[PDB]
From Swiss-Prot:
Family listed: Belongs to the FAIM1 family.
Tissue expression remark: Widely expressed, with the highest levels in brain, thymus, kidney, and spleen.
Protein name: Fas apoptotic inhibitory molecule 1
Subcellular location: Cytoplasm
Whole-protein coverage range: 91 to 179 of 179
Domain of life: Eukaryota
Protein source organism: Mus musculus
Function: Plays a role as an inducible effector molecule that mediates Fas resistance produced by surface Ig engagement in B cells.
Length: 94
């Protein structure tokens, strides 16, 4: 319950998936493109490719990862897509 903001997630991504037997909430902060799950700074790979970023973070007995894709001239607009077990994950946006 932060004492600020209201409805602005342009620089922050979120994903809700049933993990660990409960509604696992994942968030991708633009600050360091890090992943936040169960109130615990996840550990990604931070591999920068020719175009886009492949965040590789381990989750218990599973292998999840955030598929990032840059669009525009260079870094105009970037979109992150969480994936768990080779399965796309819906973002809070829309």
């Amino acid at each position: 319950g932060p004492l600020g903001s209201e409805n602005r997630s342009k620089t922050t991504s979120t994903w809700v998936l049933r993990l660990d037997g409960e509604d696992l909430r994942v968030v991708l902060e633009k600050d360091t493109m890090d992943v936040w799950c169960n109130g615990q700074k996840m550990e990604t790979a931070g591999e920068f490719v020719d175009d886009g970023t492949e965040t590789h973070f381990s989750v218990g007995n599973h292998d999840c990862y955030i598929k990032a894709v840059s669009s525009g001239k260079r870094k105009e607009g970037i979109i992150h897509t969480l994936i768990v077990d080779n399965r796309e994950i819906p973002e809070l946006t829309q």
